[PDB]
Amino acid sequence: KNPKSDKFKVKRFHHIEFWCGDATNVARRFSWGLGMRFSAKSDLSTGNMVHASYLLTSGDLRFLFTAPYSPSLSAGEIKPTTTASIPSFDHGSCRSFFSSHGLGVRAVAIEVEDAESAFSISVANGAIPSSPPIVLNEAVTIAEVKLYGDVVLRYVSYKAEFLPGFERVEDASSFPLDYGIRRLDHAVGNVPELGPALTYVAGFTGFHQFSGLNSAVLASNDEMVLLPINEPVHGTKRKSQIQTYLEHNEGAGLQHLALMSEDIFRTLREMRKRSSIGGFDFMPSPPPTYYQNLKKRVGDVLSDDQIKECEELGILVDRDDQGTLLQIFTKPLGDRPTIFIEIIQRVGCMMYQSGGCGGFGKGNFSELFKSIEEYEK
Amino acid sequence: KNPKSDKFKVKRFHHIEFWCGDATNVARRFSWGLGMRFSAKSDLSTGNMVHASYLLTSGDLRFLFTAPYSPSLSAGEIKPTTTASIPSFDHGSCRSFFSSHGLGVRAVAIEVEDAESAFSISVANGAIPSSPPIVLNEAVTIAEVKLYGDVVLRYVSYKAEFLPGFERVEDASSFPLDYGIRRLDHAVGNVPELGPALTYVAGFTGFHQFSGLNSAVLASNDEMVLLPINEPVHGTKRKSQIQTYLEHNEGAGLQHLALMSEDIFRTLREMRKRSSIGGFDFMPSPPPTYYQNLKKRVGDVLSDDQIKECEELGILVDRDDQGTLLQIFTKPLGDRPTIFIEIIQRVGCMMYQSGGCGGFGKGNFSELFKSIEEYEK
Numbered sequence: 059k060n061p062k063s064d065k066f067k068v069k070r071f072h073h074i075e076f077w078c079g080d081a082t083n084v085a086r087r088f089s090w091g092l093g094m095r096f097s098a099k100s101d102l103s104t105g106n107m108v109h110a111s112y113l114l115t116s117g118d119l120r121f122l123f124t125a126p127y128s129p130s131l132s133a134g135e136i137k138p139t140t141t142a143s144i145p146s147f148d149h150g151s152c153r154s155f156f157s158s159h160g161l162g163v164r165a166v167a168i169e170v171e172d173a174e175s176a177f178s179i180s181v182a183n184g185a186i187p188s189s190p191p192i193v194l195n196e197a198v199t200i201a202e203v204k205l206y207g208d209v210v211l212r213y214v215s216y217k218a219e220f221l222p223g224f225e226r227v228e229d230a231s232s233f234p235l236d237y238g239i240r241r242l243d244h245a246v247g248n249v250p251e252l253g254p255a256l257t258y259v260a261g262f263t264g265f266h267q268f269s270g271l272n273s274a275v276l277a278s279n280d281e282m283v284l285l286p287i288n289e290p291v292h293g294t295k296r297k298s299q300i301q302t303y304l305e306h307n308e309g310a311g312l313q314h315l316a317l318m319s320e321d322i323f324r325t326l327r328e329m330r331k332r333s334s335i336g337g338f339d340f341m342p343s344p345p346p347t348y349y350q351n352l353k354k355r356v357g358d359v360l361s362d363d364q365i366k367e368c369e370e371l372g373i374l375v376d377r378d379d380q381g382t383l384l385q386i387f388t389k390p391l392g393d394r395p396t397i398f399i400e401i402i403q404r405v406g407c408m409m410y411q412s413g414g415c416g417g418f419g420k421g422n423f424s425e426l427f428k429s430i431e432e433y434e435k
Numbered sequence: 436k437n438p439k440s441d442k443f444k445v446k447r448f449h450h451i452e453f454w455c456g457d458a459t460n461v462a463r464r465f466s467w468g469l470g471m472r473f474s475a476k477s478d479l480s481t482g483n484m485v486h487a488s489y490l491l492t493s494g495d496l497r498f499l500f501t502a503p504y505s506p507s508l509s510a511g512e513i514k515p516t517t518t519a520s521i522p523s524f525d526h527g528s529c530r531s532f533f534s535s536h537g538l539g540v541r542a543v544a545i546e547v548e549d550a551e552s553a554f555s556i557s558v559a560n561g562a563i564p565s566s567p568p569i570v571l572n573e574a575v576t577i578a579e580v581k582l583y584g585d586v587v588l589r590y591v592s593y594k595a596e597f598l599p600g601f602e603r604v605e606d607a608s609s610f611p612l613d614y615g616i617r618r619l620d621h622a623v624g625n626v627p628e629l630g631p632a633l634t635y636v637a638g639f640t641g642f643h644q645f646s647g648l649n650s651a652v653l654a655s656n657d658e659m660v661l662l663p664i665n666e667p668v669h670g671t672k673r674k675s676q677i678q679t680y681l682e683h684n685e686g687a688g689l690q691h692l693a694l695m696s697e698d699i700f701r702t703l704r705e706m707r708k709r710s711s712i713g714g715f716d717f718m719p720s721p722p723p724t725y726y727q728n729l730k731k732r733v734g735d736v737l738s739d740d741q742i743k744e745c746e747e748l749g750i751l752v753d754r755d756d757q758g759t760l761l762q763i764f765t766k767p768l769g770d771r772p773t774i775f776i777e778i779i780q781r782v783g784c785m786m787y788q789s790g791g792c793g794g795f796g797k798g799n800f801s802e803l804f805k806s807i808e809e810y811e812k
C-alpha cells in the first residue's frame with residue numbers, strides 16, 4: 059500500500075554532506091576508497107573565507123565534505139555579506155557537531171520542486187526549522203529542517219554548477235575514478251525511540267511506511283527517497299549495535315549510507331583491492347555454509363559461478379517476493395563505531411527499477427545466524 | 436663552529452604526532468600518499484577509551500595520528516586509572532588545538548637518554564612545562580615542554596612496541612607500502628618573532644645555531660636533531676607566506692616536515708602518481724630555465740640524465756661548500772595553507788652522513804627568482 063501522501067513534490071536524493079575537522083583529508087580518503095571523482099570545490103581559492111567544501115561524485119551520488127576555517131578569516135562578515143557558499147553553515151554548529159559526534163553526516167539533501175514551499179509546509183506540519191530558505195544567485199534555493207539528532211534534512215530546488223559559488227575542479231586534480239557506484243539507495247538513522255522519530259518525520263513530510271534493533275522505512279511517493287530509522291532492542295544476548303552507536307555518537311545520528319552499484323562484483327573487487335592502502339575495510343565474511351545455503355534460495359537468480367563470486371567477495375544475498383538483493387557492509391568509516399557504508403545492487407522490479415526492489419536484507423539476520431551455527435557444527 | 440652545548444643527551448627524532456579530528460581518515464590518506472605502513476595502534480580495540488592513535492612508519496620515520504573519543508567513554512576514569520596510552524593527552528586540549536589550528540603537529544618527539552632528566556633540566560633552564568615525566572609500564576618515560584605556539588617538544592626515553600599499550604597491527608591491515616622515505620631530517624616552526632623563539636628553545640635545550648622570511652636552525656650535539664624556526668618579513672612586495680601561515684593557523688606552529696628519502700627520484704615518482712588519487716600535491720615546478728641553469732652549478736654532481744630526471748619530477752637542487760641538496764615541497768597537507776611536507780635527499784659529507792649536509796636550500800630562493808625572470812624573457 060502506497061498512499062502517495064507526500065506533502066510536497068520530492069524528486070531524488072541530491073547529496074550527502076559530511077561535517078569534518080579537515081575536509082581535504084576525508085575527501086581524498088573517500089575518493090580513493092569509493093572511486094569517486096573530485097568534481098567541485100568551494101574554499102579559499104574560490105573566495106570562501108568561511109568553510110572548505112569538496113564535492114565527490116560517482117554517477118548520481120554526491121558526497122560533500124565540509125570543514126570550518128578559522129572564524130578570524132570572516133570576522134568582518136555578517137550574513138548579508140557572507141562568503142560562505144552554503145549559507146546555513148555556522149562555525150560554532152560545525153565545531154560542536156564534530157566535537158560531539160566525530161566525523162559523520164550533517165545533511166541528507168533531497169531535491170524538491172520548491173525548497174521554500176517544502177520548508178514552509180514542513181514547518182507547518184511540525185518540522186523543527188534549522189535554516190530558513192535562502193535563494194542563491196537567484197538560481198538555487200536551500201532550506202533545512204531537523205531530521206534526527208544533529209542531522210538535518212536539506213531541501214534543494216533549482217529554477218533551471220552543484221551550488222552557486224562552487225567551481226568545477228581543474229581536471230588535472232580530477233582523476234576519473236569509478237568503481238561502479240551510481241546513486242544513494244537509502245540513508246538510515248539511529249534513534250533511541252523509533253516511534254516518536256517516525257511520527258515526527260512522517261508527520262512533516264507525508265512520507266509513508268515502506269536482532270538488536272527494530273526498524274521501519276519512510277518513503278516518498280515514488281519510493282526513490284528512502285529514509286529508514288533504527289532503534290535498539292535492550293536486554294539482548296549481545297549488546298545492540300544501535301545502543302553502541304548511540305553511546306559512541308553522543309545520541310541519534312546517521313548510521314549507514316547504502317550506495318547502489320551498477321556492478322557490485324566490480325565495486326567490491328575495486329574497493330577490496332584498496333582496503334589496506336587507504337580505502338575502506340569490510341565486515342568479516344559469512345561462513346561458507348552461508349554460500350552453501352545460497353543455492354536453495356537464489357539459485358534461480360544467480361549461477362553457481364555468480365554465487366562463487368559472491369562468496370569470494372563476501373557479498374550477502376536476500377530476496378523478497380518481488381526482487382533480489384546483493385549487499386555488503388563496510389567497517390566504520392572513521393574512528394568511532396558509528397557511521398558505515400553499505401554497497402547494494404538490486405535485481406528485478408522492472409516496469410526502470412522501482413524503489414526498494416528486494417527489500418533491505420532483513421532476512422540476512424536469520425540466514426547469517428543459521429549459517430554461523432551450521433558452520434560451527 | 437659546534438660548541439656541543441646540549442644540556443642533556445639527545446639521540447634522534449623519534450616521532451611526529453598530528454592532532455586530528457578523525458585519526459583514521461588522516462592516517463589512511465597519509466599512508467597512501469607517502470608510502471608509510473600502518474604499524475601500531477592504540478584505540479578502542481586495545482582498551483583505550485580516551486583517544487584513537489594510529490602509527491605510520493617508513494624506515495625510521497614515525498607519524499602518529501591521534502583524535503579524541505567522546506569524553507563520556509572515559510568519564511569514570513581519573514588520571515591514576517586512565518586507559519589512555521599517551522598520558523599527556525587531554526580531550527579539551529586536543530579539541531581546542533584542532534578547532535584553533537586545524538590539522539597539524541602537536542608534538543615533535545625526540546628520543547633522549549633520560550626523559551625525566553631532560554624534562555627537569557629543560558624546566559630548570561626556562562622551558563614551560565606541558566606534561567611532567569610519566570613512566571609507562573616501568574619501561575618508557577615521556578615528558579613534554581612547550582616548543583612554540585601549541586606545539587610541544589616531547590622527550591621519550593627507553594630503559595631497554597612503539598609505546599606501552601600500543602599493539603602491532605594485524606598484517607592483513609598492514610600493507611608494506613614504501614616509496615623510499617626513511618627519516619625525519621628537520622622540523623620547522625613559524626613564529627611571529629624569531630629572536631625570542633630562538634632564545635627560549637636554545638636556552639632550555641642547549642641546542643646551537645647551525646624572501647619573506649628570516650630563519651635560523653637549532654641543532655643537537657651531533658646535528659641530527661634539527662629544529663629550524665622562521666619569522667615573517669613585513670612590507671615585502673608579495674605578502675610573506677609566514678604571515679599567511681600565522682593568520683590561517685591562529686598563531687605559531689609547525690610549518691614543514693622535511694622527510695629524507697634514500698631515493699628521491701623514486702619517492703617523487705610514487706608520490707606524483709598518487710597526487711590525484713588520494714595522495715599529496717606538489718608545488719608548481721620551476722621554469723625550464725631553472726634546469727638549464729642546473730648544469731652550471733651541479734653538473735659535477737648530477738649527470739645530464741639525472742638533471743633531466745629532476746626536471747621531469749620538479750626537483751630543486753642546492754649546494755653549499757660541503758654537500759648537495761635535492762628537495763621539493765608539497766602543497767598544504769590539509770584545508771588550511773599552513774603545514775606542508777618537504778622531501779629531501781642529501782649527497783656528500785660522508786665520514787655515515789653528517790647532519791644538514793648541503794644546507795637547507797636557501798640558495799633556491801635566488802635561483803628560483805632568477806629562473807623565473809629568465810624564462811619570462
Ligand SMILES: CS(=O)(=O)c1cc(C(F)(F)F)ccc1[C@H](O)[C@@H](C=N)[C@H](O)C1CC1
Binds near residue numbers: 286387419422
Ligand atoms: C541495519 S544493518 O546495516 O545492521 C543490516 C544488516 C544485515 C545483516 F546482514 F547483518 F543481517 C542485513 C541488512 C541490513 C540493512 O541495512 C537493512 C536492515 N534490515 C536496511 O538498511 C533497513 C532498515 C531498513
Ligand SMILES: CS(=O)(=O)c1cc(C(F)(F)F)ccc1[C@H](O)[C@@H](C=N)[C@H](O)C1CC1
Binds near residue numbers: 650652
Ligand atoms: C622555508 S621553505 O619551505 O619556503 C624553503 C623554500 C625554498 C625555495 F625553493 F622556495 F627557495 C628552498 C628551501 C626551503 C627550506 O625548507 C629551508 C629554508 N631556506 C629550510 O627548511 C630552513 C630554515 C632552515
Ligand SMILES: [Co+2]
Binds near residue numbers: 244246314316400418
Ligand atoms: Co541498509
Ligand SMILES: [Co+2]
Binds near residue numbers: 693777
Ligand atoms: Co626545509
